[PDB]
Amino acid sequence: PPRKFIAIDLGTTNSIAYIGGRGIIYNEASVMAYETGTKKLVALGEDARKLIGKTHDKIEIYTPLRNGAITDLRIAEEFIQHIGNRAKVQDVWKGSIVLIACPKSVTELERRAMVEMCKHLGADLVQVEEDTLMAALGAGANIFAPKGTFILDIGGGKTSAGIISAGGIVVSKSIKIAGNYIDEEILKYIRAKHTISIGVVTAEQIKKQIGSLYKGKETKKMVIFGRDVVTGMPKETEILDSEIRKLLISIFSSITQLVTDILESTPAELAGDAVMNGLLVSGGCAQISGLKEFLESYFQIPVKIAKNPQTAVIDGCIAYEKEIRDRL
Ligand SMILES: [Ca+2]
């Protein structure tokens, strides 16, 4: 009987967990809530993230991962244990093979601590890899070839970019300008320009429905509702795709600067791959309309949007099961 394979994409806003033979058992916010002063779990994932607004006083909300940052290693273990509890199987960790994908900001100390933590839970083997390496494999890139792979992952709380060659990361950097920032900046733009406060969900909907980085085949506008800034009264206004496009382009100056920084670090041996093969784009924001065209216009290299951008990291972990088992 083979050892169970467990993959955890720690993620930047949501975590995703996969168990061999079960599939993906967790995919939502990296948040948990307890009755105050206890470890009595009242909500996990989305059910807990909702309450961040005004939590019931007899309830404490914990955020083990804030934009991909580990807030506390003991709190991170609680969260990992809650994920494994989803399997509803006694001793899910015993003798298992565990792969954890994490942002590069997770220090070597924290990665080694998570290895000891999972081994203490019962794992036979624990391996920690960077999310950009797994995202490229999940999105369909041959990360094991000596050819240069150039990856950009726009998630919820981090945007990362890197160069991959021969199964490993050659260089990678990350910034804080990502999906959550974009939603909040849409909110702030509409408050300043239309004197109405919208909720985060309306901001996300604006992004999805009419947001773009490049002038497409359809001109759209949108009716939205929010709180009038002066009076507080519910108020309606129309938002044009052109003003949101201008806003998104301004935000993405940070993301094109990140790609420029990575491209400026390309070794001479891989420069041809950058020019001829170009960029692969994954993450939740990879589906912003016109992103391919916007990036191709700026960098004059090919850009490819991943087929599975929302799940590239965990899909790569799932594909990486063979490599771990093979090399064993
Ligand atoms: Ca800017």
Residue numbers in the entry: 17 to 344
List sentences from the manuscript.
MreB is a bacterial protein belonging to the actin superfamily. This protein polymerizes into an antiparallel double-stranded filament that determines cell shape by maintaining cell wall synthesis. Here, we studied MreB3 and MreB5 in Spiroplasma eriocheiris (SpeMreB3 and SpeMreB5, respectively), a model organism for studying Spiroplasma swimming. SpeMreB3 adopts a canonical actin fold composed of four subdomains (IA, IB, IIA and IIB) and consists of the same secondary structure elements as CcMreB, Thermotoga maritima (Tm) MreB and SciMreB5, except for the C-terminal region.
The crystal structures of nucleotide-free (Nf) SpeMreB3 and its AMPPNP complex were determined at 1.90 and 1.75 Å resolution. The Nf-SpeMreB3 crystal belongs to the space group P21 and contains a single molecule in an asymmetric unit. Nf-SpeMreB3 forms protofilaments along the crystal a axis in the P21 crystal. Thus, the protofilaments are arranged in an antiparallel manner. The interaction between IIA and IB' (with and without a prime indicating i and i-1 subunits, respectively), which has been observed in CcMreB, TmMreB and SciMreB5 protofilaments, is not found in the Nf-SpeMreB3 protofilament, whereas the IIA-IIB' interaction is conserved in Nf-SpeMreB3. This IIA-IIB’ interaction is mediated by a hydrogen-bonding network and is stabilized by an electrostatic interaction between E285 and the N-terminal end of the α-helix starting from V216'. Nf-SpeMreB3 had larger ω1 and φ values than SpeMreB3-AMPPNP complex Mol-A (4.6° and 3.5°, respectively), showing a wider nucleotide-binding cleft and a more uneven overall conformation. While our Nf-SpeMreB3 crystal structure forms a protofilament, we suppose that ATP binding is necessary to polymerize SpeMreB3, since filaments were not observed in the absence of nucleotides under solution conditions. Although some intra-protofilament interactions along the filament axis were observed in Nf-SpeMreB3, the interaction area is smaller than that in SpeMreB3-AMPPNP. This difference is derived from domain closure upon AMPPNP binding, suggesting that this conformational change is necessary to form filaments in solution.
